[PDB]
Design a protein around this ligand. Structure first.
Ligand SMILES: [Zn+2]
Length: 462
RNA sequence: CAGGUCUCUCUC
RNA sequence: GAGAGAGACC
């Protein structure tokens, strides 16, 4: 992805868009009970903690574009995936606006505590002023659909979150590109059924993990991905996507029966306009971080990518022997013979993709179930029932989260969440965590899940 | 101060 | 089943 141009808002007649500049995050009552290296991300250009120009680092992610049109490997890759999707019988028909706004069994309603985006978030209009969960009123939506229309600018803010320190000195905070409610609604109308199917079907048919439940999904992965594992990390996946991958996506959506009107919407996320503060810019390539279908579209593109890489990198690759699961840029995959990702990464490079060894390994080693991660969690066979697989969030990550809070009113829920994550690491580790929590006054005030009960509840999920 | 998923907590 | 919160992940 590449920034094409940057004009003042005056020249473009776009409204200014300013986000918060002070972090909501404060050290929690556990900040000095647990070790951690992470601090709230740099939000503002005159942060004492900085060591580079802020805005420079912000948009460094857009590393450029290599390919703009699918070659033969990508075309063949697109087709193999779309064929695999055909057995899902995705409803290519347009979802109703009442449904697209207020949700279904398999697609959550549009979030209403959240910004309506351009231009409403500059005209003091909330989504609570356009939508009513209780009415399912869609009439006022229709109206604004027509006033402001489609293909509105995204609204660029900086993400409020913990970051490792190098990323704080080096200023590489992340960006939130807020879609307009208009585009969200229309995108949900166009692909809502696709969202539904994907959510209802995490696994190796969609090749997506969106909608999985890691407590239970983790036991199926060694069966869904038989054979030899491979894995790797991207840098700036979303931003690094060149327009070819959206061309590629278009092929898949077409092959599974989408009308050319529908397919025509992909160009609208490949080529986007963004307002950040007092300026307007253009991005060609790159997945807009906050458009409808980000996770699903990134997951599909990843499925196109992994196939293209294999058959352009190796001889006699049988794509049918490929199993993979993706959640955005995160991938786990298997093949009947080992795959050397050093070679995939070299091919990746030609495609504008920067692929590094899995989990910040210095070099591409072998990936096995004993060191694989997916969604940050490991794989750990239960000691009693070796076929039940524990997802293992690393305690290190769990301690990074507990040392901060955005509202200490909600400490209870926060610590309870972390325990649901921590117990999988085993009894010993968990009781170490709990008693560290208890080691502090409000820690003795919290209701903490019993390890035995967590386990018992887990076993009963099966 | 985006898009989502999952899980939990609270209430009718 | 519906409203209200939170947390993690992508
Ligand atoms: Zn443009």
């Amino acid at each position: 992805g590449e920034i094409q141009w940057v004009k003042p808002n005056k020249e473009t007649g776009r409204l200014n868009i300013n986000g918060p500049t002070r972090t909501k995050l404060e050290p929690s009552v556990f900040h000095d009970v647990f070790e951690g290296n992470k601090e709230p991300a740099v939000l503002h250009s005159k942060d004492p903690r900085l060591e580079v120009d802020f805005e420079q680092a912000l948009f460094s992610k857009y590393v450029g574009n290599t390919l703009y049109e699918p070659d033969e490997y990508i075309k063949e890759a697109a087709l193999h995936y779309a064929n695999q999707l055909k057995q899902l019988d995705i409803d290519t028909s347009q979802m109703s606006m009442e449904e697209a706004c207020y949700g279904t069994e398999n697609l959550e309603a549009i979030d209403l505590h959240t910004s309506a985006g351009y231009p409403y978030s500059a005209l003091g209009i909330k989504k609570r002023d356009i939508l009513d969960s209780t009415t399912r009123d869609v009439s006022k939506m229709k109206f604004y659909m027509d006033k402001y229309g489609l293909d509105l600018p995204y609204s660029t803010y900086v993400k409020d979150e913990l970051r490792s320190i190098d990323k704080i000195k080096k200023g590489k905070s992340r960006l939130i590109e807020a879609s307009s409610l208009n585009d969200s609604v229309y995108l949900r109308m166009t692909f809502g059924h696709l969202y539904e199917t994907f959510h209802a079907n995490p696994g190796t048919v969609t090749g997506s993990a969106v909608g999985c439940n890691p407590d239970t999904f983790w036991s199926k992965l060694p069966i869904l991905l038989p054979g030899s594992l491979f894995a790797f990390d991207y840098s700036g996946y979303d931003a690094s996507l060149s327009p070819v991958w959206f061309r590629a996506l278009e092929l898949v959506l077409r092959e599974i029966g989408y009308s050319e009107e529908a397919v025509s919407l992909v160009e609208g996320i490949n080529h986007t306009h963004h307002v950040y503060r007092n300026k307007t810019y253009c991005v060609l390539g790159g997945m807009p971080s906050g458009c409808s279908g980000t996770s699903i579209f990134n997951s599909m593109i990843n499925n196109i990518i992994i196939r293209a890489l294999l058959i352009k990198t190796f001889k006699g690759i049988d794509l049918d022997e490929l199993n993979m699961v993706a959640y955005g840029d995160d991938v786990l995959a298997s093949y009947p013979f080992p795959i050397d990702c050093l070679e995939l990464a070299r091919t990746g490079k030609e495609y504008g993709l920067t692929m590094t060894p899995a989990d910040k390994s210095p070099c591409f080693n072998e990936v096995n179930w004993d060191n694989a991660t997916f969604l940050k969690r490991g794989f750990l066979p239960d000691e009693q029932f070796p076929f039940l697989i524990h997802p293992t969030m690393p305690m290190k990550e769990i301690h990074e989260s507990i040392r901060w809070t955005k509202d200490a009113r909600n400490t209870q829920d926060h610590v309870r969440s972390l325990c649901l994550l921590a117990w999988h690491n085993g009894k010993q580790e968990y009781e170490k965590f709990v008693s560290a929590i208890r080691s502090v006054p409000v820690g003795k005030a919290l209701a903490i899940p019993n390890y035995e009960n967590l386990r018992r509840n887990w076993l009963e999920l099966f």
